Amino acid sequence: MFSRPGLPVEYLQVPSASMGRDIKVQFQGGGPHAVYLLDGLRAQDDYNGWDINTPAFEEYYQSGLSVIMPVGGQSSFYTDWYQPSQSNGQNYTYKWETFLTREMPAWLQANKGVSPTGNAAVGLSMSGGSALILAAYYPQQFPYAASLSGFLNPSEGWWPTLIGLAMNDSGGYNANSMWGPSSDPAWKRNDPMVQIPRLVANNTRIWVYCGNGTPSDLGGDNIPAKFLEGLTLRTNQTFRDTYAADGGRNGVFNFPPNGTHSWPYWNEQLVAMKADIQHVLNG
Numbered sequence: 001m002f003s004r005p006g007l008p009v010e011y012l013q014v015p016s017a018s019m020g021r022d023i024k025v026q027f028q029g030g031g032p033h034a035v036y037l038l039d040g041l042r043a044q045d046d047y048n049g050w051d052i053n054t055p056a057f058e059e060y061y062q063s064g065l066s067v068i069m070p071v072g073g074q075s076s077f078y079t080d081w082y083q084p085s086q087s088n089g090q091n092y093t094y095k096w097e098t099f100l101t102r103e104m105p106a107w108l109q110a111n112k113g114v115s116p117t118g119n120a121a122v123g124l125s126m127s128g129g130s131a132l133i134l135a136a137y138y139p140q141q142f143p144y145a146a147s148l149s150g151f152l153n154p155s156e157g158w159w160p161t162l163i164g165l166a167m168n169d170s171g172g173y174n175a176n177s178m179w180g181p182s183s184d185p186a187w188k189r190n191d192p193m194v195q196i197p198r199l200v201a202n203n204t205r206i207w208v209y210c211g212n213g214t215p216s217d218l219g220g221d222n223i224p225a226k227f228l229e230g231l232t233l234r235t236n237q238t239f240r241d242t243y244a245a246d247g248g249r250n251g252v253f254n255f256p257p258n259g260t261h262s263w264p265y266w267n268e269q270l271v272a273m274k275a276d277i278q279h280v281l282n283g
């Protein structure tokens with residue numbers, strides 16, 4: 001849990017005009033290019049889950065890369081929502097894509113000397129897909145994206161229902177307020193599987209971790225674990241195969257037999273990809 005004392009970790013308050021509030025960002029300056037470490041479904045407002053559960057700051061200290069951990073955004077999918085969640089009295093609209101792609105990089109450039117371009121987005125659970133979507137639509141910002149136990153085909157089959165159940169359980173957030181009903185174009189727009197051709201066209205460097213066993217942040221009380229595990233396996237296989245079929249050739253896939261959907265394995269992936277990110281971003 002957390003990193004060793006004495007590191008140059010700063011707790012920053014970054015204004016978001018789109019959300020009408022400051023967003024807390026934990027930051028370790030270490031070079032003009034950065035790794036954006038995105039949190040999972042149950043993201044809290046005190047610390048990013050990467051900091052709470054891993055020594056990520058310590059691991060990337062003196063790596064030649066800055067580390068950016070935005071704080072907050074429970075159940076947000078790091079996306080721009082249509083409107084506030086109508087199930088929990090949310091009193092503003094999540095605009096996390098606007099924050100991550102416009103507001104935050106402008107502020108970090110002016111205040112911390114971080115380049116708005118040539119960075120990596122690394123996500124897990126909820127934010128695995130977010131990382132891939134950010135790279136799909138903002139390739140200059142994110143030539144590198146990692147999805148660790150992400151939801152790779154959120155618009156397909158039972159996934160919109162299962163994601164909705166999880167979002168409601170995680171703070172009472174309503175998926176309808178986010179991307180509309182499952183027939184709405186926003187579901188396909190934000191679906192990594194559907195956006196494979198963008199990832200291929202831009203030659204995004206992708207790193208995908210597939211986990212085994214008990215699901216992370218998925219479905220609800222009614223859903224049998226085995227059913228969910230089977231859906232996850234088949235969706236992951238479909239993503240890897242479709243990426244290849246669509247001409248993708250810049251993706252590193254990871255499926256260790258003992259790997260689970262858990263912080264120790266997500267951290268192992270973060271450690272494993274460090275040299276890769278250094279090479280891609282810094283030469």
Ligand SMILES: *[Se]c1ccccc1C(=O)N[C@]12C[C@H]3C[C@H](C[C@H](C3)C1)C2
Nearest residue numbers: 208209210233236237240253254255
């Ligand atoms: Se990520 C995933 C999901 C479903 C099936 C297979 C995989 C996957 O990445 N498999 C491997 C197998 C071998 C060769 C490649 C690199 C390692 C080891 C994982 C692909």
